Amino acid sequence: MVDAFLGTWKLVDSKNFDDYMKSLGVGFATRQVASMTKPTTIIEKNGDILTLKTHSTFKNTEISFKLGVEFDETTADDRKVKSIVTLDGGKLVHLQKWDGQETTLVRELIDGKLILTLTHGTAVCTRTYEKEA
């Protein structure tokens, strides 16, 4: 059910990422470099385990998880969070919890593109990824 998310994806558009990062308390210098970074996201499965890599010139992250099972995560901005990823309405929904705060990272396939919507507080960022051959 996750299979159409799998593969290598490149960022092609971003809206409001600075607002999202600022809401999370990311410092201005980190925001500045992130506003110009074009990450590559790689999503692979092996049985019930998904691995999601985010690679860039700036920061790199990797998580592995089973859908519907909580995992500890250290985010790119060094937040220590409790995470869970679920499929909901065909969307891959990643919820992070820390210090009573929440943020959602929601991925949806629209016309073969991967739309990532990042919400924290009132900030809503939309990032568009396109598949690599």
Ligand X SMILES: Cc1cc(C(C)(C)C)c(O)c(C(C)(C)C)c1
Q: Which residues bind ligand X (CB under 6 A)?
A: 21, 24, 26, 30, 34, 37, 39, 54, 56, 58-59, 61, 75-77
Q: 20: annotated binding-site residue?
A: no
| Minimum gap (Å) between residue 60 Cβ and ligand X | 7
Structure tokens given for 75: 């985010």
| Nearest distance in Å: CB 47, ligand X | 26
Q: Is 31 annotated as a binding residue?
A: no
Per-residue DSSP letters for 71-84? EEEE-TT--EEEEE
How would you label 94-132 residue by residue, b for 16+ Cβ within 10 Å and e otherwise? bbbeeeeeebebbbeeeeeebbbbbbbeebebbbbbeee
Smallest distance, ligand X to C-beta of residue 57, A: 9
Residues at the binding site for (9Z)-octadecenoate are 127-129
